[PDB]
Amino acid sequence: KGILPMKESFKYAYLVLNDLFQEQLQFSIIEPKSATKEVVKAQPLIGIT
Amino acid sequence: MREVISIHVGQGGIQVGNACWELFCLEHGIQPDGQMPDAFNTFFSETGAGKHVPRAVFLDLEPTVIDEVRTGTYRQLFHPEQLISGKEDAANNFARGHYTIGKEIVDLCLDRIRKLADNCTGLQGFLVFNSVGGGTGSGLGSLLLERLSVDYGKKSKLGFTIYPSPQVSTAVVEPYNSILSTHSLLEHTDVAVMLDNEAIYDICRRNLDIERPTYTNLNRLIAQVISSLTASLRFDGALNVDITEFQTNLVPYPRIHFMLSSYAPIISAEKAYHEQLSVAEITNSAFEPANMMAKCDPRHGKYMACSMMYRGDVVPKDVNASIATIKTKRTIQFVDWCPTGFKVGINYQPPTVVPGGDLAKVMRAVCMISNSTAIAEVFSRLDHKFDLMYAKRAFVHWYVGEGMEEGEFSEAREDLAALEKDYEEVGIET
Numbered sequence: 001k002g003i004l005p006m007k008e009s010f011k012y013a014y015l016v017l018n019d020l021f022q023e024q025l026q027f028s029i030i031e032p033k034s035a036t037k038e039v040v041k042a043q044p045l046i047g048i049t
Numbered sequence: 050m051r052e053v054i055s056i057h058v059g060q061g062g063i064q065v066g067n068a069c070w071e072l073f074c075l076e077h078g079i080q081p082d083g084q085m086p087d088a089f090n091t092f093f094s095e096t097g098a099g100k101h102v103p104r105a106v107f108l109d110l111e112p113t114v115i116d117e118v119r120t121g122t123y124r125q126l127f128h129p130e131q132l133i134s135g136k137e138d139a140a141n142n143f144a145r146g147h148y149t150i151g152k153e154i155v156d157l158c159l160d161r162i163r164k165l166a167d168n169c170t171g172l173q174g175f176l177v178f179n180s181v182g183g184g185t186g187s188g189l190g191s192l193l194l195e196r197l198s199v200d201y202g203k204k205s206k207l208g209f210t211i212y213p214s215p216q217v218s219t220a221v222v223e224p225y226n227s228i229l230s231t232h233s234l235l236e237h238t239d240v241a242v243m244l245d246n247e248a249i250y251d252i253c254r255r256n257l258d259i260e261r262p263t264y265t266n267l268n269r270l271i272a273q274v275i276s277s278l279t280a281s282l283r284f285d286g287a288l289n290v291d292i293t294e295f296q297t298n299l300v301p302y303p304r305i306h307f308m309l310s311s312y313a314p315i316i317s318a319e320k321a322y323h324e325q326l327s328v329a330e331i332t333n334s335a336f337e338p339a340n341m342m343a344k345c346d347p348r349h350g351k352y353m354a355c356s357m358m359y360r361g362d363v364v365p366k367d368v369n370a371s372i373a374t375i376k377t378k379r380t381i382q383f384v385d386w387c388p389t390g391f392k393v394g395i396n397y398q399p400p401t402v403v404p405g406g407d408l409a410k411v412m413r414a415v416c417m418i419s420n421s422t423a424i425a426e427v428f429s430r431l432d433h434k435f436d437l438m439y440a441k442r443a444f445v446h447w448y449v450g451e452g453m454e455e456g457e458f459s460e461a462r463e464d465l466a467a468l469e470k471d472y473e474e475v476g477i478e479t
């Protein structure tokens with residue numbers, strides 16, 4: 001969302017650190033964020049008779 | 050000069066007709082041979098010298114029950130050629146008894162009905178009994194009602210149908226023909242009374258203390274209810290009620306005529322006399338939800354009108370003093386547009402006891418016929434059961450191959466939806 005008031009230099013340093021931790025330790029220092037996607041699915045009009 | 054004709058179709062109908070016809074013969078002093086060793090005229094007819102002939106006709110396509118009737122102790126009572134019997138059973142198929150084999154038998158039944166009606170001079174109306182969850186019963190009942198509605202017109206017909214229990218069932222296909230028969234009698238019968246077996250089983254278990262009941266015990270209670278309903282036509286009473294005085298008091302609208310009954314007291318001789326059986330306590334017991342003769346909860350809906358019959362030595366002031374108490378209670382609420390909803394009848398003749406039966410002899414009894422908004426639950430659950438199998442068109446081939454069209458199932462569903470919407474529309478306050 002661009003809400004973190006961070007200098008770009010620190011943003012790149014943090015990403016490089018995260019990639020290093022993900023390769024070496026299989027862990028991310030970045031917290032996962034949820035992305036909600038509206039999907040349109042088909043449902044049959046089963047008549048509630 | 051007042052008469053009524055009772056129609057019995059199907060195995061359940063014949064087995065409850067036997068139950069009511071021991072009781073009437075016992076109540077009027079007529080021996081099983083038909084010979085006495087002016088109130089009989091409502092149900093019977095005089096032959097000139099000696100025996101009496103019931104104003105009843107027995108119908109069935111399957112001959113076993115009629116053959117059992119024609120060899121029992123009551124072989125001499127019924128006229129030999131009013132026990133119409135077929136050869137082939139409908140086998141729980143509604144389309145069979147409405148389109149295939151019932152049509153060839155219905156003409157003889159209508160001829161018998163005409164021959165019985167020409168004898169009566171003051172015909173009050175017809176009674177009909179049929180277990181709904183069967184082929185021949187539902188189909189022939191529908192066809193007979195449809196023929197009578199046009200042959201006679203405005204004559205009143207009363208239907209004591211036995212709907213299937215909520216969960217207990219004997220067949221697997223009874224929702225289909227139950228729904229179709231409800232469709233047929235919705236626009237053709239003036240009164241329909243609910244009679245499912247599970248509620249009466251619970252009544253017997255709790256009050257009569259019988260742990261292994263059979264169908265005869267159920268049919269005796271139904272016979273007692275019928276006798277209580279029709280007592281006012283053949284016995285002197287301080288406040289009489291006629292059959293024609295019902296649609297003016299219990300039926301607010303032409304579509305709504307399904308109501309559920311109750312009876313009180315129900316007690317055995319082993320502990321009946323230890324308590325006084327006052328009118329107040331019996332009229333309280335009659336309104337108990339657990340004593341409904343159909344497995345429906347009246348606490349889930351409003352009341353529309355209550356017609357309730359007394360018989361014995363009851364005094365009107367005691368009846369009024371008990372109606373006031375019921376109006377007082379907060380757990381029983383009537384619909385807004387009905388300030389008074391009680392119709393009261395008082396008769397002097399106490400209920401008669403059948404030897405070897407369950408009920409004891411008492412001096413006071415009460416029978417209520419109550420129309421309530423809560424009845425929609427049975428329609429909803431039957432509809433839900435119907436939809437489950439009609440979604441996959443199961444068992445439909447047994448009906449399409451007997452002459453019925455494919456679309457005939459849908460319109461019964463639409464009429465039930467209309468009835469359920471109507472019951473909801475009526476019960477809302479203004």
Ligand SMILES: Nc1nc2c(ncn2[C@@H]2O[C@H](COP(=O)(O)OP(=O)(O)OP(=O)(O)O)[C@@H](O)[C@H]2O)c(=O)[nH]1
Pocket residue numbers: 058059060061062064065111138139140141142180181182183184185186187211213218219220223246264265267268
């Ligand atoms: N209360 C009561 N119900 C009964 C009695 N006998 C049968 N039934 C009900 O009737 C339903 C089936 O219809 P039946 O009357 O047995 O048979 P039918 O009406 O002659 O129809 P067919 O099967 O074609 O012969 C069952 O689900 C039972 O619940 C009875 O003696 N008393």
Ligand SMILES: [Mg+2]
Pocket residue numbers: 059060111138185
């Ligand atoms: Mg049968």
